[PDB]
Point group: D2
Chain length 430, copies 4
């Protein structure tokens, strides 16, 4: 009746597995959570449904969750983010995976629907990225809200919607803001994008960054990381923002801050990092230099008005998967990446292992908090314990040969902190 | 009986005044506070006692406070930080200033004591930087605690002590953590030091940064700013930390993290940014390469064990004010800057105007909150309203020609934020 | 009898063609050479044999040479550098191309041999990269030296051998050092590598650069570019050199300079940019951290002793084309890229179009000088006219929206240079 | 009759001496030339007249020359570059020095004239920086050209004039282009300015670099160094050039290149590095944002039309020595630094010791070549032997703990270079 799993080519298992193994060596935190909670199986009895890009980095997550006693059913939260060799490794491993690269919007839904019912019954835990899973249930299958003990949100856009649902009393189950974890936002969002953005642009366009003008919308952690990447390759980065502080920041870094209306005329590479709609409109496409490269790294695909291009370009020619060159009426051409979808995951392989390890460690910690200490998490949206947070960072120091210092009784006194204990207040922003 | 003011040479007034005027053009926020509250005189009735480095930047602060109706009596919170031409300008302006560059520790106290009693009676407000003023009274003149309505703390070390006093029930008056203001910590502590540290080292030693090895203790905002400075000139930066997160950060930036015990052997320039004691000991001085330059930018002078040097060096020769070259017993020489005291303010001119403007604006806002809305500030230590915070940033965007963007009703809707109102949650760390 | 061309899959033409067209838009110089010398056909009568990585960038070169009246027969100077879609586009265009990705060393020779005889007879012009073509003939087919009018050398290693052949009186035909062209060495070697090195590492390993230790051997233009790339991602770069100046340079940039003997113990990514043998030996592989990534970007494959690995590792497992993971006896694993071959071209797509345009324009200019002004080029090795050099740079300013300034008669006088003419002496190093 | 020496305050000797000693420790090459040729006194019989900024770094040069047997008479080649404590140290040392800070253009000449006649008769050697000395004699005292054995030129502007004199057969004595020395142009011109420019701007204005727009005219080594400095502090750098290559360079680094005519409207700090006249005119001053800071780091003072300001401003108010604030007619103010003169030397202390040691070493080597091997240097302008050049770099590696690598007989063979000998061709540009 139901399918055991759904993937592109399970014959990609062997290669995926090699990829997973190589990656495991790069994710200290994840492997540390394994070496510590494999026997106790803290996630015993858990039936987790997760909506996250099925990548090699995600397979190591899923496997770590299964190692901790959980039962998992997975789906990608992106139609192009899946890494078919990593997905055929999780299926063969015997885990039910319904994901492949290039699913029609319609299949994207069916895949999530498969992960809603397990052997022993429906899900009782949600691991989300983007918000699609926690919303599909809240609005389509509300009868399951009662059997779900918690929610784990990976990205900014997802967490923004949680705070919203709660604001309008729509959130019926507890959730942990995993994104806002210092070791998540300041490392995954910032450093991950600094490396994985260009990987997406390059692999798809093979364009030269040096000498070009790059326009980045939004100066959040993702923006700061994308800007520093481009700018560090010889590109001239212009930044657009709606926030005074963030903007004063881009300015105090040498970046020129102005409106997209004025910038669209100068840039060659446009990257949207803001988490809101209508960042790049037809009114802009009409001013862009020939063959401008437009991509978006925010979570969803409405920052760039693709429909406009689709309904206003003389012709569209697909160069290769997730790379289209449009011919406007003024003759210029617009190279669109991943149909306005996430560029790093759509055209590249996403963030590198080491950084994803920080995020996924917070993700496993969260599931264990929600599924084992329900009391501390009443309906609403909470942060992961500062202690747990500082634990992720600490668990990655050894791989990098980092040598922390130690206070002396005398020092620990001076400050008033614990020579071996915490000293950082929660006002600390890092 | 009592003195009207005490400064080095009041004949420096004319030059100071020009300095102040040139600076006023660089401090938008301060001038904006003047152009908005000069008639209402919100600080009317206030008798402020401030302990802050008497600099040109501070003169523009004091004058702004007087412009808002306040009565002010000043003193520097450092024996070497004073800028005699700016102090002789405030004195001539008719404001009682008791400060000069190079006071004996004994004069340093008398100076603060002068600013405790005004014409109309004792102080009723405290503007502090470092914690000396709010402590001099809490422990030496407790009878005045009753007449003080509030406290304004400039720096980390000062705010750390406030949180401490409160912890042990020693704080008898309210205070506002000005340092932790995003537009203060992320701009003054980080960007100010990135520019003003080297200004201190250079003016004193004229040392070449490129090619050297620079060891920076502590990776807080000050540390990150100092590291990026040195590292940006061609120096090789090594970082020492006691915090996992901060350390994983230094690491993810290309910086080598290890202990001072190992690092003291490689470095040429040592800069302590940590806010605790015994960061550099004699056990280290004995391993430092010849003519190593040691300086401290943290707030107080015990990070570097100067006493050791003083009691263990074969000889000490003063090159010029605040620059000493010591001859150890192994023959090497150790160039000490400002006797372990703040290097940027002792050997240079402190942070540049534009950045101090952000900090001092928060400082003026604070005084107005404490002296006008006492109800909102019960004994303890509070942050300055996020709204007031984001107001400092916003008031400096024009001078930098920064063009903010504006959401459309449609967008403001999408997000759920106010097209013209705030959208940043307090979890935001920036 | 003889084959018309030899490629992998000529059905890749359509895709290649699109790639070529997109690239043409990025190579101003090349297209400018076409729009100026297509009618005159200055290369009329020319029968060029070229040994250069058959890439999309190289197809635009070949086609430009045919546009100028030349007759071309091509071959790749690397067994892994070929770009099969770009090669099937040149074959379809009707140009004899003998090249594919992954040829056996034996086929690599047959391929070059095919390009030695044209319809109208043997070659009369040599376009080389690496030195293999001008050496195959000088040593294997010396009877052809008489019919060859000149030589064009693309890379440092190739040009180093020319100066050598000449030194021992082995060079029987004139050659132009194209590499040493300012617009070639300072743009292709430095900026090209700064972008294309990591493209190779990433595409193959997908490794995270931030937080790692990268060892780069040699601080030439290639070294400087690779160091800045890595270092710019958050990696810690150590450099090894044999030259005082170059080393003092790395040092004055914050880079630690030491021997490979000491560094092999700390690095995670090893990149050889030196153009000499035995840079990385077994004695090193035995000290590298687990899963260390080793790659070479110099021109030939003997910088890294791959034979040792091949003859001393417990086992070798191929992850995917041009990516091997070795199991040493101490248990550590060594991920070797492209079998010690050129990493950017073996695992990625090489330098980006725009930069290659500079180098290839110098390459076309050179053929025109050799084939049209033989007099000015007597047997030996010459530089390309500074005028022609400064012409490449000039021809790319427009695409970048660069606005040069113009001296006034008054200024042109002051300096003594020509208001519209050259003013840069040949001592200028840039 | 004649004066023994002329300085500001010889009581500054003691302090200067300490300065000299601290500096000597930073100049390895200079001290190495002393430890090797002090006994042989290769400059015995020499009567050197030098026109170079009398700085602490220059005293170590002069003393090194005297240590090698030379007789010296000095003068500053700038009216504001002199460092009075370093000059009063050379005078006390018993060396005739005629230089102070702030001499009238008239005294500037008298000072040079003093250094033309020694005890044993007139000069026989010229050490110049700028060209004033070799020109004062070639045009005012041609009778001495016969007794001068050689010329040493420090800076680009000076060397450009030599090549000129020669071009019009005006040069009557041999000269060595010291500037063009790789270890001079690529270290002093580029790295020295990257550190000493801002030292000049900061000490005089104390302006904040972050957030500002900085316009640099000319992308030579000086330009590249200044741009990287400002840009590295958070400023936005625009560049103007007249050369295609240099310009394509600035572009490939992320810098916006345009005309001063368009840029004068955006910048806040203007820095001329070009070696030509009329870079900044009144037509520009009339468009600059209020309180714009204008300075020039080129060698002479005509890059900025100061006369215009002087003849067109409503008023000029001197803030402090070498700092003037002008009031234009449109109301804006223009802060001029050092009256258009060299900013790093006029408002700061010039390049740091370690870098000056490279240039001054080349300067000593040159004097020894000219005065001892006159044969190898016929009338004209020559470069210093590459061997001697590579010897400066080499002599500074130890202070920086740089560990060079050593080829093996096997490698030395492979390349064809000498395992212990040179391998770098003269085409190398670095
Ligand atoms: N593909 C990936 O690897 C990753 C994607 N993300 C996604 O990126 C987005 C942003 O993440 P963060 O940097 O953490 O968000 P953020 O909230 O820190 O920053 C986005 C910034 O955009 C600004 N902004 C909003 N509307 C704007 C407009 N119309 N024009 C200009 N600026 C505007 C906001 O003020 C804000 O500062 C989210 O949707 C998140 O899900 C986050 C991390 C990784
Ligand atoms: N002179 C100036 O212009 C300024 C001075 N300051 C002063 O600098 C100090 C630090 O300020 P922030 O960066 O805001 O503080 P911070 O608290 O953010 O960072 C100091 C860092 O040092 C680390 N640390 C503590 N003890 C250590 C030890 N023994 N070894 C290594 N690392 C250690 C701490 O974990 C912390 O991350 C304070 O005393 C503050 O008052 C702050 C701003 C400007
Ligand atoms: N794959 C590519 O895209 C490109 C490859 N190349 C190749 O890269 C190589 C180097 O090119 P360039 O930077 O122009 O050469 P280069 O001669 O400027 O620099 C190589 C440096 O290595 C140093 N070196 C030599 N032997 C060494 C050793 N045993 N240990 C440490 N350092 C050592 C040399 O002193 C020299 O400074 C050449 O073989 C060239 O063909 C050049 C340009 C692009
Ligand atoms: N104050 C100091 O410490 C030092 C000063 N200098 C001086 O700086 C000047 C330049 O030195 P280098 O960088 O070695 O010279 P350079 O010749 O390498 O570069 C100057 C650049 O200016 C460009 N240029 C000329 N006229 C121009 C104009 N009207 N607009 C825009 N660009 C223009 C030229 O094409 C050239 O690339 C010389 O006068 C030299 O004496 C050199 C070294 C140190
Ligand atoms: N390789 C990857 N595997 C899984 N999630 C990823 C990867 N790269 C980026 N992400 C996440 O993508 C979301 C936004 O969908 C994040 O919050 C990132 O942490
Ligand atoms: N020029 C200056 N004037 C006043 N305070 C300053 C200056 N430079 C730095 N500071 C402050 O010094 C303290 C630490 O004493 C801070 O928190 C900085 O904001
Ligand atoms: N895509 C490419 N096509 C052709 N040659 C290239 C490419 N990328 C790098 N090269 C050249 O590779 C040599 C060394 O083989 C160079 O000198 C570079 O200019
Ligand atoms: N402190 C200094 N002492 C002597 N010459 C210097 C100093 N700083 C810069 N210069 C030189 O100034 C010229 C241009 O006048 C140079 O070529 C620099 O090498």
């Amino acid at each position: 009746d139901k399918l055991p799993y759904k993937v592109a080519d399970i014959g990609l298992a062997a290669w995926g597995r090699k990829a997973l193994d190589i990656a495991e060596n790069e994710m200290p935190g994840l492997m540390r959570m394994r070496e510590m909670y494999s026997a106790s199986k803290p996630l015993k009895g858990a039936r987790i449904a997760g909506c996250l890009h099925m990548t090699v980095e995600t397979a190591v997550l899923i496997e770590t969750l299964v190692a901790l006693g959980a039962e998992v059913r997975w789906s990608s939260c992106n139609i192009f983010s899946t890494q078919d060799h990593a997905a055929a490794a999780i299926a063969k491993a015997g885990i039910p995976v319904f994901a492949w690269k290039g699913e029609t919007d319609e299949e994207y839904l069916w895949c999530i629907e498969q992960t809603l019912h397990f052997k022993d019954g429906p899900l009782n835990m949600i691991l989300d990225d983007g918000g699609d899973l926690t919303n599909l249930i809240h609005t389509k299958h509300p009868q399951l809200l009662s059997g779900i003990r918690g929610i784990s949100e990976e990205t900014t856009t997802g967490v923004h919607n949680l705070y919203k649902m709660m604001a309008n009393g729509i959130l019926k189950v507890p959730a942990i803001n995993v994104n806002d974890s210092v070791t998540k936002s300041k490392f995954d969002n910032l450093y991950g994008c600094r490396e994985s953005l260009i990987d997406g642009i390059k692999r798809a366009t093979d364009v030269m960054i040096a000498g070009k003008v790059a326009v980045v919308a939004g100066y959040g952690d993702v923006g700061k990381g994308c800007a520093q990447a481009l700018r560090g390759f010889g590109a001239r980065v212009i930044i657009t923002e709606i926030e005074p502080i963030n903007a004063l920041q881009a300015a105090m870094e040498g970046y020129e801050v102005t409106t997209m209306d004025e910038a669209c005329k100068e840039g060659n590479i446009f990257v949207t990092t803001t988490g809101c709609v209508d960042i790049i409109l037809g009114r802009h496409f009409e001013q862009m230099k020939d063959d401008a490269i437009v991509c978006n790294i925010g979570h969803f695909d409405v920052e760039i008005d693709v429909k406009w291009l689709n309904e206003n370009a003389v012709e569209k020619v697909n160069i290769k998967p997730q790379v289209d060159r449009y011919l406007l009426k003024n003759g210029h051409r617009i190279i669109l990446l991943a149909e306005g979808r996430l560029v790093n995951l759509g055209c590249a392989m996403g963030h590198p292992s080491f950084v994803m390890s920080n995020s996924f460690t917070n993700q496993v910690m969260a599931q264990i908090e929600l599924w084992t200490h329900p009391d501390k998490y009443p309906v609403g949206v909470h942060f992961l314990p500062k202690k747990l947070d500082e634990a992720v960072a600490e668990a990655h120091l050894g791989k990098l040969n980092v040598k922390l210092t130690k206070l002396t009784e005398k020092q620990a006194q001076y400050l008033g902190m614990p020579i071996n204990g915490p000293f950082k207040p929660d006002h600390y922003r890092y």
